[PDB]
């Protein structure tokens, strides 16, 4: 209820980790 | 001024980890 | 069982994202 | 219990820290 | 004013550290 | 380059703490 | 054991985020 | 300007309360 809101913010984190990635690969 | 974007998600996923772990252990 | 499993692919994920993003950027 | 509290303050500050030195 | 709350929560910290470290 | 520090850190940070997470 | 590492690891963000704020 | 002036004492202070209440 509130720990998906931890996961939210990893997977929105990892997205654009990713999303900067295409910008450098 | 990219990754400081990417960064202070960073922190905020720490925040709610750090918070969690207080309450719940 | 069910959010713990799927938070730690999530955050090993991000581990790996982020140790390349640092190879790489 | 105790510790904790130092840390998430920390985190807090660090957060703080960093959502200005982005305006820079 | 957005730079006054950084301190404060900065030093926070710091009793926190000392009032641990007095205590053990 | 310099800002770079920072994310070793808190990536270091995160997966500490998400890894005592899961040990509590 | 490991709610050590955290703070070592934190501190030496906190501090960089800082010094990075004042340096810029 | 003075605030600049003020805050790297603190933190540097906090660095090294940190610093102790890692060491001891
Ligand atoms: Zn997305």
């Given at each position: ?11 929105e984190?990892?997205?654009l980790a ?8």
């Amino acid at each position: 209820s509130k720990l998906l809101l931890l996961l939210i913010i990893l997977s929105e984190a990892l997205h654009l980790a990713i999303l900067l990635l295409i910008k450098w690969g």
